[PDB]
Design goal:
Number of domains: 1
Structural class: alpha/beta
Pfam families: Glyco_hydro_26
GO molecular function: mannan endo-1,4-beta-mannosidase activity
Active site: 171, 279
CATH superfamily: Glycosidases
EC number: 3.2.1.78
Distance between the termini: 19 Å
Bound molecules: a molecule of 2 linked components (MAN-BMA), sodium ion, zinc ion
Strand content: 5-15%
Subunit structure: Homodimer.
CATH topology: TIM Barrel
Helix content: 25-40%
CATH class: Alpha Beta
Order of helices and strands: EHEHEHEHEHEHEEHEEHHEEEHHEE
Largest sheet: 9 strands, parallel
Length: 379
């Protein structure tokens, strides 16, 4: 592997972090990596949550290449539990780590009791009041302090920092989160993102992050629409989006997936970024109703890879496999990787996912190599 020049948001990022960026720049035009939230910490078929098992592995015999987790595992009260050990195991396997940010609401987080009050899903606008000068800026800062302390101590067995793709304030073109589009002007959102990156990088000294931006899919798929709340090329390494679609009659939605992926791919080439799909799935209500699409993964890979732009995404990530679903009283299913168990055998979804795995263009953990020791230069 010969040296390549990289330009990161953090001009002082570690060599392994720079290498990860270089890796994806190359890899992305040869495969699409499979990602999974809570890959080794949540599953329907795992017997340990210590980082050694996954539903993916039990289904196809390899782990996801990209391992997603969240600030819900970092910032107090760490509702999703610590992940340091499991991150380290993933990295030691040569996996890639990404962490999203379901931050509590800085304006209302003392008021927790009746969900969703005080959480990401508390729609009370908190952007204006959380920027410097705002009354709740110290509360936001406390979250960021905890993210920085975690990152700054996230080290492998040799004492070297583990790179993370840190994704901030996602799905911001909708209004279900407190940083969303009813909660901020575009400028206020951009300031929230830039303030936060600067705080982590410059105030707290984080050196092992790449920064990802990911709005929702657009139905009017234009660069100008993506740019409206885009933080800017100085603030983003990874151009993503999230999209959740219907379980049935979904051809239009799949064309829209491909169109958004093509857009971010073209923008990423022009801007020196990595394009990804940071979160994609059948919408949770459909899965919770017991519904399924047993061609979903086959439609996904075939649509993406046929398109000359969309195929250039580095990875796509699907959400967590909740071991006991979510409350429906009863529990209802809440998972995205088909499990190796009677329900998914019988409904054809396990077969679908195994075909996705077998596809030449998908890459799972053993399919990626030389991720972190690639030589790089910076200007
Ligand atoms: O792990 C955090 C919560 O994730 C939710 O899942 C959402 C997620 O918030 C994003 O909107 C997106 O990736 O789509 C996901 C599935 O709808 C749920 O899993 C919650 O139970 C979690 O607290
Ligand atoms: Na690709
Ligand atoms: Zn190549």
């Amino acid at each position: 592997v010969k040296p390549v020049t990289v330009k990161l948001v953090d001009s002082q990022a570690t060599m392994e972090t720079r290498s990860l960026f270089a890796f994806m720049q190359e890899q992305r035009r040869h495969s699409i990596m499979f990602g999974h939230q809570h890959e080794t910490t949540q599953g329907l078929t795992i017997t340990r949550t210590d980082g050694t098992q996954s539903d993916t592995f039990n289904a196809v015999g390899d782990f996801a290449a990209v391992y997603g987790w969240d600030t819900l595992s970092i910032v107090a009260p760490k509702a999703e539990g610590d992940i340091v050990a499991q991150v380290k195991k993933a990295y030691a396997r040569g996996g890639i780590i990404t962490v999203s940010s379901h931050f509590d609401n800085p304006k209302t987080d003392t008021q927790k009791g009746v969900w969703p009050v005080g959480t990401s899903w508390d729609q009370t606008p908190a952007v204006v009041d959380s920027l410097p000068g705002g009354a709740y800026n110290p509360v936001l800062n406390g979250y960021l302090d905890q993210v920085a302390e975690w990152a700054n101590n996230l080290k492998d067995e040799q004492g070297r920092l583990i790179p993370v793709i840190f994704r901030l304030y996602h799905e911001n073109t909708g209004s279900w989160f407190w940083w969303g589009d009813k909660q901020s002007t575009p400028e206020q959102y951009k300031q929230l993102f830039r303030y936060s990156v600067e705080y982590l990088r410059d105030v707290k000294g984080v050196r092992n992050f790449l920064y990802a931006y990911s709005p929702n899919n657009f139905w009017d798929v234009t660069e100008a629409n993506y740019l409206e709340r885009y933080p800017g090329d100085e603030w983003v390494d990874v151009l993503g989006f999230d999209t959740y679609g219907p379980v049935a009659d979904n051809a239009d939605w799949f064309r829209n997936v491909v169109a958004n992926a093509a857009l971010v791919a073209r923008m990423a080439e022009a801007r020196g970024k990595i394009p990804v799909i940071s979160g994609i799935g059948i919408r949770a209500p459909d899965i919770e109703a017991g519904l399924y699409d047993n061609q979903w993964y086959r439609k996904l890979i075939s649509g993406l890879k046929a398109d000359p732009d969309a195929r250039e995404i580095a990875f796509l990530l699907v959400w967590r496999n909740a071991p006991q679903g979510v409350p429906g009283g009863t529990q209802v299913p809440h998972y995205w990787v088909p499990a190796n168990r009677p329900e998914n055998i019988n409904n054809g979804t396990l077969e679908d996912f195994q075909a996705f795995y077998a596809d030449e263009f998908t890459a799972f953990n053993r399919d990626i190599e030389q991720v972190y020791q690639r030589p790089t230069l910076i200007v």
